[PDB]
Design a protein around this nucleic acid. Structure first.
Lengths: 33, 230, 50, 83, 52, 51, 51, 228
RNA sequence: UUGAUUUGGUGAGAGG
């Protein structure tokens, strides 16, 4: 939980941000596909 | 104080794994005490070696499949978790299994070193079906006690290992089943003495008199806190 | 539910058990006779209670 | 330590005023300035308040007496510091 | 765990007090018949391990 | 990060601080009761049987 | 289904006691539970209500 | 492969015959091992001495009645069983007590030799209604271990004792009650450990920690053979 | 001054 899977963030959205889909809180696992 | 002391008089091996052992002579009432204490210690706290990290070539995660085999990779990891190894000198060794050709992959195909002994030469792991298929796994055998699982060993491991090493759970205890019996001892002048017939069932890797000696030392060093301090 | 079964099995009686009709100097040795293996949990007995 | 507040309910017989008296006291110990009238066994201010109540040395009357004493001390401090 | 005199621990302990109230007495006959099924399995495992 | 020192902090904020346990269909007032926590290795609320 | 006498007869083919009940010792104290208890194999399922 | 040794953290001495040995922390499933081993040894194996046989005039079996006393001979048998005596040199001492006059008879009233002594002299024996009543009992003290009751004592004996001899349960072991719990302690990472709380109440003649140390060294000398 | 969208609403199924 709290990892990063797909870096997916825009500029002009300092003013840049973190929408990068991460792993939900409490889950683990192995990326199978 | 008219007490006595017991000794390991006869140690019979019914097989290579299932093996009983006597204890003689015990005092009156002590039989169930020593039997239950040695049962709890001999089931909880024995050291035995087991499979910890499995490294197959060309396989990323454990939920994939491989070319030329029957069992899937989770089946291979379960059949490797059942393995019974007996190292002598080191406490952490790396074996090697390489095999090609149609037919099952026994545990007797691992290219052993000198100080490792694989005591189950009919333990099946894979069923290679293609003659052009190969499998080259590199196992890692630690040594500990109890049960330490993959989740806790996901951050506990300090030695920064590289990615690609499948983590297998560690079933370290080589004792699986133990029963004791308090018979009537055949003492030529005493009738109020008894014997303890401990019936162990091991993983084949542990020597029963050595196991009983280690469990006795564990119990004595635990009771030294009662003996010395108050 | 479990605890009333444990009590109903504990405080009961049977017409013969280990230690039928022996006499006990207190409840402490009643539990000592139950634990050592010389009487039964339900065996009628004169005790001295305070 | 604390399991039941029954003696504290005995000495302040309303069971709804116990919460208010012990809350006034535990605010006197938390922010608070004041130090407890009782030895503390690493209990929190709640249990130290109720533990003061059980031995009969804090009620509503003692807290109002102490606050009148502090008001008189502040009055004498203001008068003796200025004049 | 509660082990019988043969030495094997029992795996899972349920509660008998559910059975007189919830009148599902079929789990007991499943328990006894599964015990008999593994009794035959242990007997075959002896006859085939100690190989005949 | 949950370092090694916050669990002593947690046992020092729990100690005398009650919590309100509540079963979801609360019908009478005995369905909200206040306990003191005892920390559990696990993910399930351990609830005293008589209660 | 199977009647009860066939359960008893199948428990006699295996070397098990006919009543279905085995005396069990306690792993903590090493001493026998009074009044022999029922041991058998029930087919237990894991439902998808995980904690 | 290294094990956790504990520290004995507490002896909450409630009375002179009471203790509570709080003890932490042990490996998971070791508190029950130590507690059960010590409990069985302290119940049925700890050596010591107490009253076994007593010969009283005026009685012929255990259901008769002497005059001058409020209580009966079952009560004198029970209050005799409650008496805690210690013998130093020998192991089979016969004692005799004689009491006359208005008043109860206590343990200090007995006639004692140089080798025996009473750990509780104000422990009551009986009470006397008549000033002309002269009670007399020949109290024999053997020395064994643990507990042997009068029921299996009369089942095991076969020699015909003289009429007037009375059997009593032989509370040889000096402890009266031992019962423990196992609680859960915490070393900063692993919460799976467990803490022992041994409670013990004895009679006189010993200090509960001395009984615990005696049982522990009994088991250690018992297991002293096949260790490393 | 150092970051972001379901609640909204429907339907279906499930737990106690």
């Amino acid at each position: 939980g709290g990892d990063i899977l797909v870096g997916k963030v825009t500029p002009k959205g300092s003013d840049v941000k973190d929408s990068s889909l991460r792993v939900p809180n409490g889950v683990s696992g192995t990326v199978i596909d | 104080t008219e007490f006595l002391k017991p000794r390991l008089v006869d140690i019979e091996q019914v097989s290579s794994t299932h093996a009983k052992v006597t204890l003689e002579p015990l005092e009156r009432g002590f039989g169930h005490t020593l039997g239950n204490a040695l049962r709890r210690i001999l089931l909880s706290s024995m050291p035995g070696c087991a499979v910890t990290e499995v490294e197959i070539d060309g396989v990323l995660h454990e939920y994939s499949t491989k070319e030329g085999v029957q069992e899937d990779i989770l089946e291979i990891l379960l059949n490797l978790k059942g393995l019974a190894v007996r190292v002598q000198g080191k406490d952490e060794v790396i074996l090697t299994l390489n095999k090609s050709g149609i037919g099952p992959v026994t545990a007797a195909d691992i290219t052993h070193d000198g100080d490792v002994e694989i005591v189950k030469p009919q333990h099946v792991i894979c069923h290679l079906t293609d003659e052009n298929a190969s499998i080259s796994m590199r196992i890692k055998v630690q040594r500990g006690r109890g049960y330490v699982p993959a989740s806790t060993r996901i951050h506990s491991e300090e030695d920064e290992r590289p990615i690609g090493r499948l983590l297998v759970d560690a079933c370290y205890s080589p004792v699986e089943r133990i029963a004791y019996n308090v018979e009537a001892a055949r003492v030529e002048q005493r009738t109020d003495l008894d014997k303890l017939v401990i019936e162990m069932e091991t993983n084949g890797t542990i020597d029963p008199e050595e196991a009983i000696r280690r469990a006795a030392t564990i119990l004595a060093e635990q009771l030294e806190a009662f003996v010395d301090l108050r | 539910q479990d605890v009333v079964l444990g009590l109903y099995y504990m405080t009961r009686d049977c017409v013969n058990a280990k230690g039928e009709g022996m006499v006990l100097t207190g409840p402490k040795e009643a539990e000592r006779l139950y634990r050592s293996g010389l009487a039964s949990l339900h065996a009628r007995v004169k005790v001295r209670i305070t | 330590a604390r399991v039941t507040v029954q003696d504290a309910v005995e000495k302040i017989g309303n069971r709804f005023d116990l919460v208010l008296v012990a809350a006034r006291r535990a605010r006197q110990m938390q922010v608070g300035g004041k130090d407890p009238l009782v030895p503390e066994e690493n209990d929190k201010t709640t249990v130290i308040a109720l533990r003061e109540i059980e031995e009969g040395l804090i009620n509503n009357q003692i807290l109002d007496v102490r606050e009148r004493q502090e008001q008189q001390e502040q009055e004498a401090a203001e008068l003796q510091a200025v004049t | 765990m509660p082990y019988d005199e043969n030495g094997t621990p029992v795996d899972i302990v349920l509660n008998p007090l559910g059975v007189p109230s919830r009148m599902n007495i079929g789990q007991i006959l499943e328990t006894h018949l599964g015990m008999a099924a593994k009794g035959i399995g242990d007997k075959i495992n002896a006859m085939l391990k100690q190989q005949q | 990060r949950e370092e090694a020192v916050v669990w002593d902090i947690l046992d020092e904020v729990i100690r005398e601080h009650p919590v309100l346990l509540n079963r979801a269909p609360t019908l009478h007032r005995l369905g909200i009761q206040a306990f003191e926590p005892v920390l559990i290795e696990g993910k399930a609320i351990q609830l005293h049987p008589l209660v | 289904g199977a009647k009860e006498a066939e359960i008893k007869e199948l428990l006699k083919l295996g070397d098990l006691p006919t009543s279905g009940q085995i005396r069990l010792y306690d792993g903590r104290t090493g001493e026998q539970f009074e009044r022999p208890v029922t041991v058998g194999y029930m087919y237990m399922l894991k439902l998808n209500h995980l904690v």
